[PDB]
Design a protein around this ligand. Structure first.
Ligand SMILES: NC(=O)[C@H]1CCCN(C(=O)NCC2CC2)C1
Ligand SMILES: [Zn+2]
Length: 140
């Protein structure tokens, strides 16, 4: 579990969104596994606006932050799970690292701010849903 709190927005994995998230919906995209809802309180996270390929992510199943090298956001095939059929997930970045069910929502960050959140795992790979292209998170 986990979310990004930027401005008056809450960014979560779409597959983990709550009823309150759907009832206060700003934007959602199943192909990216992202959903954004509105918040009453202002958050403290800031979004990175860059093309970094190195950063640090939080792994809840290890209680540890790990430094990683990650691929550029792209269209990647993700196997069938209990949340989605086998499909191409867009804006996904992969790295070598531990990720098991429960780790979605952990933040990946670089020197510029939050880059994205954990969205996939297994086989010694961790995948992150990028948010750096969502420029509207910084305003309104
Ligand atoms: N983005 C996806 O299609 C996910 C949905 C949850 C299931 N899935 C995973 O890779 N889970 C393993 C660890 C928790 C990350 C694919
Ligand atoms: Zn950066």
């Amino acid at each position: 579990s986990g979310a990004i709190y930027v401005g008056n927005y809450r960014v979560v994995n779409r597959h983990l969104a709550t009823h309150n998230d759907w009832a206060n919906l700003v934007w959602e995209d199943s192909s990216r596994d992202l959903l954004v809802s509105s918040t009453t309180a202002q958050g403290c996270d800031t979004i990175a606006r860059c093309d970094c390929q190195t950063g640090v992510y939080y792994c809840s199943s290890r209680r540890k932050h790990y430094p990683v090298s990650f691929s550029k956001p792209s269209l990647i095939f993700v196997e069938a799970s209990e949340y989605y059929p086998a499909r191409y997930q867009s804006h996904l970045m992969l790295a070598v690292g531990h990720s098991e069910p429960g780790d979605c929502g952990g933040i990946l960050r670089c020197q510029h701010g939050v880059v994205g959140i954990v969205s996939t795992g297994g086989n010694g790979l961790v995948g992150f849903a990028d948010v750096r292209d969502l420029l509207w998170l910084d305003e309104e």
